[PDB]
Ligand SMILES: NS(=O)(=O)c1ccc(NC(=O)CN2CCN(C(c3ccccc3)c3ccccc3)CC2)cc1
C-alpha cells in the first residue's frame with residue numbers, strides 16, 4: 466500500500482513487478498492472449514446475467530494508475546451472475562487500461578490483436594461478505610472485460626470523459642453519481658472465460674475472467690481525453706497516464722472457454 470512503487474515506467478513497469486509481487490510469475494496470471502481457434506465452445510455455459518438497473522455510482526478517482534468509477538455496494542444492487550459463475554457477484558468499481566496510440570492499450574488480446582483500450586467492470590462474490598475477503602479467495606472476483614475500438618463515439622461514455630478534467634492527477638476524486646454503466650455494454654453478451662488474476666499488483670489469483678467478444682466503439686476524441694490524465698500527483702513532473710496495460714502472460718495450464 467503506502468510503500469508500493471510499481472507503475473508502468475521503464476524502471477517500475479510490468480517486467481519489474483515480480484520482485485515485490487512474486488505471484489507475478491504464478492500459474493493463473495492475467496491478462497492472456499485469447500486464441501480464438503483454441504478456445505472451446507462449452508454448451509454447458511449459461512447465458513451471462515448483467516443486472517445494472519439499480520447500480521448507484523458514487524465517485525470517480527484517479528489512483529495513480531487508472532481512474533475508477535466507484536459504486537455503492539452496501540446493498541444487493543448491480544449484480545453479475547450466470548455464465549461460468551456460481552453465485553452472485555456485486556459491482557464495486559470499473560476502470561479502463563489504454564494506450565498512447567490507438568494501436569495498443571488493451572490487456573487481453575484476441576489472436577494477438579491489441580484493442581485501443583479495455584474496460585474492466587469489477588465484481589466480488591457476495592458469499593464472502595465484502596471485497597476485502599473476496600480477493601483472498603480463488604473465486605472471489607468476477608471481472609467483465611470489454612474491448613474498446615476507435616470509431617463512432619459511445620454516448621454513454623461521455624459523462625466519464627467530461628469529468629476527467631477534474632481528476633487530472635493522482636489522488637484527486639470527484640462526486641460522480643447516477644452514472645449508468647449499462648451505457649458501456651455492447652449489444653451481444655457472447656464471451657470467453659478463464660481463471661486468472663488481478664492485472665495490477667498485488668496480482669492476486671482470485672478472478673474469474675469474462676471477456677466479451679463484441680467491442681464497443683468510442684471516438685478518437687473520447688480516448689484522447691483519457692491520454693491527458695496524469696500518473697503523477699499535482700506539483701510533480703507531468704507523466705501522461707498512457708499505456709497503463711500489462712502485456713499478455715503465459716496461459717500455462719489453463720483453457721479458455723467460449724460461450725458461443
Ligand atoms: N485490472 S483488474 O484485474 O480488473 C483489477 C481490479 C481490481 C483491483 N483492485 C485492487 O488491486 C484493490 N486492492 C485493495 C487492497 N488489497 C490489499 C489490502 C487490503 C486491505 C488492507 C491493505 C491491503 C490486499 C493485499 C493482499 C491480500 C489482500 C488484500 C488488494 C486489492 C486490481 C486489479
Ligand SMILES: [Zn+2]
Pocket residue numbers: 560561562585664
Ligand atoms: Zn483492470
